[PDB]
Amino acid sequence: GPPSGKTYMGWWGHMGGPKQKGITSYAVSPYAQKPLQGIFHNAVFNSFRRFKSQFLYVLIPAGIYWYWWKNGNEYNEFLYSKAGREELERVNV
Amino acid sequence: AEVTQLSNGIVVATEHNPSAHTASVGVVFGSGAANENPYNNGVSNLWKNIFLSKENSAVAAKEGLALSSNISRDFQSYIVSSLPGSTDKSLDFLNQSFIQQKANLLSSSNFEATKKSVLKQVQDFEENDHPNRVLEHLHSTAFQNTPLSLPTRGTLESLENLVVADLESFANNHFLNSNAVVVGTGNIKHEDLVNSIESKNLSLQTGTKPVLKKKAAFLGSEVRLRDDTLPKAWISLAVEGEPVNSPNYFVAKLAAQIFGSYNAFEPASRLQGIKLLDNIQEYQLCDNFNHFSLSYKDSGLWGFSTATRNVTMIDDLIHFTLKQWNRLTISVTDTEVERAKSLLKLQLGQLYESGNPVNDANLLGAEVLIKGSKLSLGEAFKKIDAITVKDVKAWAGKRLWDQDIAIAGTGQIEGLLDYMRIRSDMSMMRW
């Protein structure tokens, strides 16, 4: 076949990753173990640990933009509420 | 020329054969690797080695007789070969230096030298051999948490942590008289039949073997030791065979011998064979086969071991072997079965009747402990011609069809797909 350019991942056998020695893997086959292990304990506990770990990264931006949105909405409401003759004109321009 | 057995305290058996003229007498203890806990592994190895060194040095210097041994899973086949006219001396030495006394043998110096020698031997076995290593790993991964997965050699951590007391404790808990026999394969007739039972020629430690709490089990697993440094590859499938003393030993042996061995670098093997060998030979896929169906008193293993050279083409070799096993359990030609019967006949004839008395003695000991009585090959030939296609169909419908497999290999296995590309394709969805 027509040779192609250099590639960072080979196929099986010549996969290209660093050669290693002494690493041992295992398995127990799907049929010899219960499919649903932990199901609830891991569910609740890991779910709460994960939600605790990254809470602030989603809390802070949401709070900031919610504060902006609330302030903008309230000022817009005040603008067109018995204020179209004394405040609307001086800020529209 | 007929095997004789009895029961007078210690079982004595004899397979007279005036064809050869190398008389052999020894013991076959019904315990070994299977009869011992994981934490103290190489105790049997250490026993065998201390014997095979110092007792050898004693016997050759004193008299003429070369002593061997063997441990497979539950034997200590301390066979002591001799001349036809020199069996009394061999028996006297065996009963004066193996059962008792053990003080002149287990000196600290000899024990320590043998300990370091055993360490070196097991180490270079780990660093050099490969098919035996993957076979041992296959046993260790098929029988997790069971007194059969531990190897017949042991682990360095388990080897180092035992000095004298553990060895003597195992001696006194397994070198009894209840599960120990005497085997006299060679060209002796009845001198061994009467001289074993004498005024004092008897094993010490009367009692019984401590029964194991759990015997055996099975579960699918993998133990791969992927290292690209080694040149070739190594894999070993496995499916749970049939234990000894069952009406399935010979049918399983035939179901294994159908596909047969293969050596890709021999002019007299590529040309012959059956479908998988041709379909492999069209390209270059594999380099060796070994269909083996090993059986033990607790459970047996039907295996398939290869050591290929191509690395990218593992998947195709596995896929073809699996489809051929499915073909075995779906439909077999009558000529295939007849050829298998003939081949297995000649193979048994060679194995059981090899001129070397030690092999026959070890096999006789194994059978007499497990079966309770020797099965002369005449009955085997009589009952082997009755094996028919329906029987093999039925047996493969149980042992093979959608049954958990265990594989374990060291080398460049990386190309091998993990589990669901070698397991869920034993039926090919069209039976």
From Swiss-Prot, chain A:
GO cellular component: mitochondrial inner membrane; mitochondrion; respiratory chain complex III
Superkingdom of the organism of origin: Eukaryota
Membrane topology of this protein: Single-pass membrane protein
Keyword Mitochondrion listed: yes
Database matches in InterPro entries: Cyt_bc1_su8, Cyt_bc1_su8_sf
GO MF terms held by the record: ubiquinol-cytochrome-c reductase activity
All ranges on the Mitochondrial matrix side of the membrane: 1-48
Gene Ontology biological process terms in this record: aerobic respiration; cellular respiration; mitochondrial electron transport, ubiquinol to cytochrome c
Mitochondrial intermembrane side of membrane: 80-93
Compartmental location: Mitochondrion inner membrane
Keyword NAD: no
Keyword field: Electron transport, Membrane, Mitochondrion, Mitochondrion inner membrane, Respiratory chain, Transmembrane, Transmembrane helix, Transport
Transmembrane residue ranges: 49-79
Binding partners and assembly: Component of the ubiquinol-cytochrome c oxidoreductase (cytochrome b-c1 complex, complex III, CIII), a multisubunit enzyme composed of 10 subunits. The complex is composed of 3 respiratory subunits cytochrome b (COB), cytochrome c1 (CYT1) and Rieske protein (RIP1), 2 core protein subunits COR1 and QCR2, and 5 low-molecular weight protein subunits QCR6, QCR7, QCR8, QCR9 and QCR10.
Note: Present with 6140 molecules/cell in log phase SD medium.
Functional description taken from the UniProt entry: Component of the ubiquinol-cytochrome c oxidoreductase, a multisubunit transmembrane complex that is part of the mitochondrial electron transport chain which drives oxidative phosphorylation.
Family under the similarity heading: Belongs to the UQCRQ/QCR8 family.
Protein name stated in the entry: Cytochrome b-c1 complex subunit 8, mitochondrial
Gene encoding the protein: QCR8
Curated annotation (Swiss-Prot), chain B:
GO biological process, one term: aerobic respiration
Function: Component of the ubiquinol-cytochrome c oxidoreductase, a multisubunit transmembrane complex that is part of the mitochondrial electron transport chain which drives oxidative phosphorylation.
Key words, A-Z: Electron transport, Membrane, Mitochondrion, Mitochondrion inner membrane, Respiratory chain, Transit peptide, Transport
Any one Gene Ontology cellular component term annotated for this protein: mitochondrial inner membrane
Similarity comment: Belongs to the peptidase M16 family. UQCRC1/QCR1 subfamily.
Pfam hit, one: Peptidase_M16
Assembly and binders: Component of the ubiquinol-cytochrome c oxidoreductase (cytochrome b-c1 complex, complex III, CIII), a multisubunit enzyme composed of 10 subunits. The complex is composed of 3 respiratory subunits cytochrome b (COB), cytochrome c1 (CYT1) and Rieske protein (RIP1), 2 core protein subunits COR1 and QCR2, and 5 low-molecular weight protein subunits QCR6, QCR7, QCR8, QCR9 and QCR10.
Additional observations: Present with 19300 molecules/cell in log phase SD medium.
Compartments where found: Mitochondrion inner membrane
Native source species: Saccharomyces cerevisiae (strain ATCC 204508 / S288c)
Primary location group: mitochondrion
Membrane topology: Peripheral membrane protein
Protein's UniProt keywords contain Glycoprotein: no
Protein name in the entry: Cytochrome b-c1 complex subunit 1, mitochondrial
Membrane-traversing stretches: none
GO molecular function: metal ion binding; metalloendopeptidase activity
